[PDB]
């Protein structure tokens, strides 16, 4: 199912911009043509109506994405070998700050090459690559150079594959629609075999090298990874069970492998991370489970399941026919699959962000506060963006590919017939949550201002205790020995076990208390999430029609309005709902990251002394100061911003410059959001007049930006400015202290 040489390789189409569209290829009468060229670059569905060609175009771009990712990985690995102090950091991870970037001295920018330890001058990095390299057994820079070379080779291979599968042998449509085979392969081979290979690498390389490192041996005296394979005596000395070979595995005497395959739980006191034996056992079990899961769906040999057969058998007295017809929708529309995958990926990213901080998987990662904060905020933002994109593409599918005549589905029909109740109930829930979550903050502020601290919602006057979460913490703290007999310690130290882990005089992790403030902040999170969901679902559900504009589907997915009639019809399209929900996503993620930062700085992170007294960074003021808006403004925003505003003249002045630059970018966006196109089109007419006077009027007539373009520019600049401000503030605050 491939075609030989579908499209000739030529430079002819390079010299004719806009060849993908008939209208754009005509020529640039005005300046709107240039903007329209870029906005429709990757909309393959608008270029042609053939599903096979769209699938072939989609298949090739992923190869370019993979090549770009491989180039990025190659650069990251190469910079750590040539412009880094990784070897010096390896001998003292607790007193040296990782750095992998140096700057050329031209205009006085060499001040950014601050001292970081190990006789090195550079920029301190917070991506956590040093911990990953240490956990993999990497010791010298030659291995990093080899990894960079391999990544370059893989990027070249990906680029060649991308060219080949589009210009020499393009698969047919019947190849793409083999969902059962694709699922079987991506489950058994992509995931299970990868987990098995990583488990093997961890067993044979990471474990002995990491044990030698934790023993305190000089990294230059540790035997090379290949010495543990050729010389089984070394492994037998390290692990006696290796002397028996693979015989216990094939005789089901798996108890002999308990030395390097454990079920301990908790953190390693030496490094502050999870035990590597637990990780190896976890990867082995996950590989087995994924290998089993990949033999469910039917193929050329009869045995297995048919996804259509599974779907068609589920229906209920409330839902009618049920899931019949969903198989044909998901195997014919690219947008629905994209929306579902984007939503699932965003949720998974948020879950990963939440899980990484409380269960540190890398050595010397819990005590690196900047890395933890950066990873948390980065992954949360990525998850939010993916979640928004899911709804955007769901609306796109609803507008374009919906067709009840040939693709009828009962479940989709029933949802669209009672959307008013869903929207009204969601509106009521949002209003109730906003009143009963944010209103308690204003009450506390008013009572504090009036001089009545005894009438506030606080731990000392009127308690609002999160009794349900405390019960979960108590249950999980008592899990070992009762409901998890095979475990020695709890999964996390934050459950409330009472034990504290200190590495290098710093607090890695300890139980986290929950009080009245956590109740309020959690309900604030719920309120913001509910409002965002309301906006996106209202946008998706009313994409085709409404009581105001019955024929909204004919106007398309991205149109500005339908005139000033009916009192005003501004921003009625589904695109405008995504444009509006991006702001609320930004708001929710900012509140969440502020909560995380303040809570960790106030109740977890700190230093321990010889007598064992913990002194936190901010002194534990979160409980009594976060219950008012004035407290958030004073003890968090005003107090913690002194690091970034006093960074001039030092190696951290770049963050100080980025603070003001992001301020300017954020403030600059309000011009596009608060104004309209007619004023700017009328203003241009006067500017064109004087150019005509001096014979400098261009033939490409200048036109003001369209309404949609202006809204997009405004939202983009707004988001960029806000995120850059928060990034600069966080990094400047956390690197110094």
């Amino acid at each position: 199912l491939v075609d030989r040489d579908p499209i000739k390789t030529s430079f002819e189409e390079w010299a004719k911009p806009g060849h993908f569209s008939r209208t754009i290829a005509k020529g640039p009468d005005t300046t709107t043509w240039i903007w329209n060229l870029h906005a429709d670059a990757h909309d393959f569905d608008s270029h042609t109506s053939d599903l096979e060609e769209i699938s072939r175009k989609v298949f090739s771009a992923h190869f370019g994405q993979l090549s770009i990712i491989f180039l990025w990985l190659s650069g990251m690995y190469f910079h750590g070998a040539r412009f880094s102090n990784y070897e010096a950091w390896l001998s003292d991870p607790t007193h040296i700050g990782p750095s992998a970037q140096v700057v050329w001295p031209i205009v006085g920018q060499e001040i950014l090459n601050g001292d970081v330890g190990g006789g090195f001058r550079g920029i301190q990095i917070t991506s956590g690559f040093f911990q990953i390299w240490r956990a993999s057994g990497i010791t010298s820079e030659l291995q990093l150079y080899c990894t960079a070379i391999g990544a370059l080779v893989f990027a070249a291979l990906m680029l060649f594959a991308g060219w080949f599968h589009y210009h020499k042998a393009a698969p047919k449509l019947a190849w793409f629609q083999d969902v059962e085979s694709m699922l079987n392969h991506h489950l058994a081979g992509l995931l299970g075999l990868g987990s098995l290979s990583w488990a093997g690498h961890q067993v044979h390389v990471s474990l002995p090298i990491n044990q030698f490192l934790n023993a305190g041996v000089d990294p230059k005296e540790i035997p090379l990874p290949h010495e543990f394979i050729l010389n089984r005596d070394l492994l037998a000395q390290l692990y006696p069970s290796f002397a028996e070979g693979a015989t216990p595995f094939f005789t089901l005497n798996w108890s002999k492998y308990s030395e390097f395959l454990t079920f301990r739980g908790g953190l390693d006191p030496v490094t502050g991370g999870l035990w590597l034996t637990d990780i190896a056992h976890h990867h082995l079990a996950i590989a087995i489970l994924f290998l089993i899961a990949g033999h469910m769906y039917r193929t050329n040999w009869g045995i297995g399941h048919g996804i259509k057969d599974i779907l068609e058998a589920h229906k209920g007295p409330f839902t009618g026919q049920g899931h019949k017809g969903l198989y044909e929708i998901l195997t014919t529309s690219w947008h629905a699959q994209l929306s579902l995958n984007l939503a699932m990926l965003g949720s998974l990213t948020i879950i990963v962000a939440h899980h990484m901080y409380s269960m540190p998987p890398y050595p010397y990662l819990a005590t690196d506060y900047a890395t933890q904060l950066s990873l948390f905020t980065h992954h949360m933002w990525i998850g939010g963006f993916l979640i928004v994109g899911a709804a955007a593409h769901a609306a796109i599918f609803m507008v374009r590919d919906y067709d009840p005549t040939n693709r009828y589905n009962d479940l989709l029909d029933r949802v669209l017939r009672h959307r008013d109740a869903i929207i009204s109930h969601l509106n009521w829930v949002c209003i109730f949550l906003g009143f009963h979550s944010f209103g308690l903050y204003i009450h506390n502020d008013t009572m504090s201002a009036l001089g009545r601290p005894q009438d506030m919602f606080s731990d000392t006057a009127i308690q609002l205790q999160p009794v349900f979460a405390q019960w979960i913490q108590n249950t999980h703290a008592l899990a070992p020995g009762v409901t998890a007999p095979g475990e020695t310690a709890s999964t996390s130290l934050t459950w409330g076990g009472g034990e504290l882990v200190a590495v290098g005089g710093k607090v890695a992790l300890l139980p986290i208390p929950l009080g009245t403030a956590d109740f309020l902040v959690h309900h604030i999170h719920a309120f913001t999430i509910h409002v965002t969901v309301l906006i996106l679902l209202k946008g998706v559900l009313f994409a085709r029609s409404s009581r105001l504009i019955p024929d909204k589907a004919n106007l398309g997915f991205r149109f500005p309005c339908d005139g000033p009639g009916r009192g005003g019809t501004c921003q009625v399209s589904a695109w405008d709902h995504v444009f509006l929900g991006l702001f609320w996503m930004y708001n929710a993620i900012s509140v969440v990251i502020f909560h995380f930062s303040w809570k960790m700085q106030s109740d977890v992170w700190g230093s321990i002394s010889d007598q064992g007294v913990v002194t936190h960074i901010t002194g534990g003021n979160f409980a009594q100061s976060s219950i008012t808006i004035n407290g958030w403004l004073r003890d968090f925003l005003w107090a913690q911003a002194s690091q970034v505003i006093q960074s001039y003249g030092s190696s951290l002045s770049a963050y100080g410059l980025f603070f003001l630059g992001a301020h300017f970018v954020w403030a600059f966006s309000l011009m596009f959001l608060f104004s309209g196109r007619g004023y700017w089109q009328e203003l241009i007419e006067s500017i064109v007049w004087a150019h005509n006077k001096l014979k400098v009027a261009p033939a490409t007539q200048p036109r003001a930006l369209s309404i949609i373009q202006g809204r997009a520019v405004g939202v983009t600049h707004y988001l960029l400015g806000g995120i850059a401000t928060t990034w600069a503030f966080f990094l400047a605050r956390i690197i110094a202290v």
């Binding site: 009468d29 001295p105 001058r121 006077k693 001096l694 490409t700």
Partner: protein, 152 residues
């Protein structure tokens, strides 16, 4: 002493600023071995700072009460290098750029589809036009005198 200012070479605050910067730079040098590359970089930075301060002292700038140089733009001949000469150089360069752009725009105005020559530049024609802007003042003045500069 215009507006109560003092020369850089006679200002004590200027020397204090130089000493403070040099002392701040020398503090980080003690953390590294003399043969190490960061020591060489810090030595070069110190030498550059000393050279910059000496050059500022030599050029006859005026310092305020804070030990910072100030610029006089009123037209005094003693300070024609701060504003006048760079201004003339900038005016010449900007006139060159504008004249080249206007000439290129005028040249392609008679073509069948002039908008096509604006997104895809006719490189030989532009290159032949680029060198012409070196004498832009004379051409502009004579075009003004003949009444060609302003569209009718």
């Amino acid at each position: 002493d215009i507006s109560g200012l003092t020369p850089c070479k006679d200002s004590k605050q200027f020397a204090k600023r130089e000493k403070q910067q040099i002392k701040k730079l020398e503090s980080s040098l003690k953390l590294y071995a003399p043969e190490s590359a960061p020591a060489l970089a810090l030595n070069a930075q110190i030498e550059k700072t000393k050279r910059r301060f000496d050059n500022y002292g030599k050029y006859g700038l005026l310092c305020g009460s804070d030990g910072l140089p100030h610029l006089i733009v009123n037209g005094d001949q003693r300070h024609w290098g701060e504003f006048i000469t760079p201004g003339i150089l900038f005016l010449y360069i900007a006139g060159w750029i504008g004249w080249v752009g206007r000439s290129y725009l005028i040249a392609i105005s008679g073509e069948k589809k002039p908008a096509m020559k604006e997104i895809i530049i006719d490189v030989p024609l532009a290159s032949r036009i680029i060198f012409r802007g070196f004498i832009w003042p004379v051409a502009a003045y004579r075009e003004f005198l003949n009444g060609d500069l302003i569209a009718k």
